[model samples]
Target: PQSVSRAAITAAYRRPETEAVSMLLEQARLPQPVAEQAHKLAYQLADKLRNQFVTGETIAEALANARKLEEKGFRYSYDMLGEAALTAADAQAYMVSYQQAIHAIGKASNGRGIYEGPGISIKLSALHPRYSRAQYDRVMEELYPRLKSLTLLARQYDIGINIDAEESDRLEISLDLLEKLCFEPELAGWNGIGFVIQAYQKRCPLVIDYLIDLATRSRRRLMIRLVKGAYWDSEIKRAQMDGLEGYPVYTRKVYTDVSYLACAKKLLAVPNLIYPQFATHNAHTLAAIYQLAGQNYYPGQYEFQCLHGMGEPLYEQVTGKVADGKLNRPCRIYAPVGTHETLLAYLVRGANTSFVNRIADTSLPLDELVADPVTAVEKLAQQEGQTGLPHPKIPLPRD
Candidate 1:
């Protein structure tokens, strides 16, 4: 638990050369091979993060977890683990793996349509390593066909597929890809496809507006998952490294939380345009969403989501037992399925200090967590100061 609090286990990856665990392991001090030994021990424990968080290495195993979740009155979505592919072979392999997952998920589906049936979350980066704005032409040429096929497969299986948002730099590219795909005849009329919007981003409201515009113009219903985001540290570091004008994400955790609720209000306001999926671990955010939805809120207009291993207790409370006669809120568990190797990046990112701290701070009373959205926006605008250009793309070296 201490390791999780300080992210010490994963921090070993960035251990200092001399006093390894001193700063890395919170307040602890270590010397010599003891520090070295700690690194090795951490590596040994690294694989265990998957056991705690990931469902399993195979689709069948993931489905087993899904069954248990469904029994608890929760829906589910599976994410096949892998980051940006490093080679064409890797990308193509991921494509096959996703297709295979769709087949298995489709078979295991409860046939309740997109809302309740087992869905899938996709990382566009996994489909192509060079997924960048600079390589837009190359990416479209190479990645489009593959994704088109996957979307078709998802449509055939009658399951929803949410294109996940990653780093700040890839935001534009990801949006472009989704917009293009949405208008294609192949994916037309399939309300099952969707995209994720990170509330941490400074431009979150703008992003939501963009999504609303895209959905309206394309004449297609959209599903948008609003999350507090997980890549804060990296986004900040990247901005500093590139000498960017300003941070792409909110510096304060509360800002992000408030932004989430603000965006939730926006998404809910246009219920006819977007099916909002609110994924969070914060009680206030959940409560605020319920309050915002008011008395008429039904099971399907929108839903709540949490990671597979985390938030079980909170959700248990949110969704009361049958005897309570309370309408248990619908929630979907975001289950990751893959081997230990595929789980490392996700584990490391999730263990980020910002994420851990956010979890701790989220325990505050509902009123504080549910700060006035209008005031939150004004403060965020002040923090943003002068407008900065979109995060500049650091060019990849030419082959």
Candidate 2:
């Protein structure tokens, strides 16, 4: 789309605004309301930017990029785009896409003769929604068989399968699915199953403790991917809109870095030899993990994951160590794909790419008048507000 152009992505990273990866549709002509909303969103995103975080590309594009990373002793995980399917049919169609992607991945690994086969990650909300629990369950019932079979197939292909966790409301449902699909007796060995948990969440400890207990009881191996979170901005915005306490704040970056490293320590200590996947792009945080992993003698079994494109330089820095055995950990990256237009919705929420994401991801020339990224974001926000696009945290005061 015109919104997430290379200029936009560059602007986002260089000096970003918070409006999102997409420009407001109604605000195309500088409407008053959109300009106001976009400005507010720009400010909101600015506050949430992390240190040098990378982002994913479309699945195929990401896979191609991973091949580059593989040359440096790095691996990648495929995070397919799109989410929150409302109907059974939509979910089924998504399944078709998933199946096709997996089949291709499996075949590619076989032909290449390398362990570089990309693993798959999925968010259940992409397959089910909140309004129809029973219907969603029915969908899962049908989908479970396919997912299980796919898991088995991937294992045979030596590919790993990971499940993504979403907002609090749906956390329980995700856990239920993970347990049944990976641990329940019928699916056979779920040794390859992996689950993601966001450490910034207040209830994070409970979730981790529960998983530890669950792992102890099941007596089966489990893989855990720890991340600071992708939904932090959305969660905070949602809370502000609802007049509720906002999500927990990690005032200092160290808070999250500590959380990730601690989680890595705890997960590695598991009796069953758990796999710890570090999802981050910050060099300092990564350094902490490197030190911790070294202290524990976790060599080769752990993996480091980063988004596809946002922080290529940082990725190389980390992957180089993995290649040299300095870190003794495997590295992975996330890739996304889809049309520029539809993905703009992802941008609108400021979910997919960073502030300069749209600019960097696009092919357009940077607006010379707005060369500075933050300025560019503000300009876009101003234009969007004038056009009546709502800021992500509309009617809510900026902090």
Candidate 3:
């Protein structure tokens, strides 16, 4: 439960559905006229949220919409949105959609090269009904072929196909699948192969080392997108539900930042094997990453990234002409392309706890928002009670 401070409650009101939800909940006990307005409120709420986050209802539309940004120096990586497919039929449909989307994206690219042209982002679960470690054999046999074809199609136009990070349990299995793809005779020497790393994960540093080793041995340069993560909220609940001994992700924010930078330093140091894509909305994280990456940058050496709708304002100030600023860094927008229903499902997940939600917010202190993670971690490590401690409010399930 949160405190009842008016300031604390303010952000909740900004969420698309909060006002409509509160009104609808009370209307159940109110007059008939009030009940009638609930339907209208619901429709308006959905539309508002959809318009803010979703790029378009189709790949063509999404591509056209993102063109304006692309012209301004923000590259795009189109993500076809859908909930996890439960049936084989659903997975098959999503696979077909992805293939079609790739063709559309490829046509638009016109062979401008992977980094300059827009890319495609995918989720393994959407490609196969069973994508878990327990179903490893099935994933390798069924989904691997689909992924291969998709990547091949993407490779046709020299566009990258990045595998987005999902739930914690799927991490190791995805790496297994990735390993197999690395050795695939056809994909050998192609630099468009990409993967995402969630810095919030407890195993992040180890994962980077593993990735480095994999890239080293495979001799293929992998595009690694380092992010804050997607499963922070559910991961904690899942550990408690399963009665596990620990959490897979860090419970607090600053530790995640420290891990992001820690993993980032490793990524930056190895420019040959891994092309680091830093995906962040936080100004501090962006500044830290920019500074760490240094002044020298090739066409696609390393780049900053952000989501499509929420990232424009901030990226606009930095991307185009740095004659107006210090850094003229390039940014890739993660644009979701799908129908409103499919797009909205991911939108909720997208805005869950992003710094973009507070981009225009004046409530938080600028100092606090841009505080250096190094200082926070240093202060915490200075004391015995603080070092290696999980958030006090976020305890282990068994505890």
Instruction: Tell me the spans in candidate 2 whose CA falls farther than 4 Å from its real position.
Output: 1-65, 111-116, 129-146, 241-254, 271-273, 295-300, 321-328, 349-399
lDDT of 2 by residue, 1-399 (tens): 111221222222111112222222221122345334434433332223322122233455545545656777666666567656777677776677776667666665664322345677765656653422444466457656656765666676666778876665455556666656656564355466778987655445456666776665567667788887777666655666666433342322223333454555676566364677877664434544554454455433577787765545555544556445333456777655554545654445443333245334345332331122223444655876632223444333234
Question: Which portions of model 1 miss their true places by more than 4 Å?
Answer: 1-51, 132-134, 320-322, 325-327, 350-399
lDDT of 2 at 393: 45
Cα lDDT tens digits, model 1, 234-274, are: 87677677765456665555456555766787888897789
Best by lDDT: 3
> Between candidates 1 and 3, which one is better according to lDDT?
3
lDDT of predicted model 2: 0.53
List the lowest-lDDT window of 10 residues for candidate 2. 12-21
Best prediction by TM-score:
3
**TM-score of model 1 vs. true structure:** 0.76
Indicate the TM-score of model 3: 0.84
What clash count does candidate 1 reach?
Answer: 0
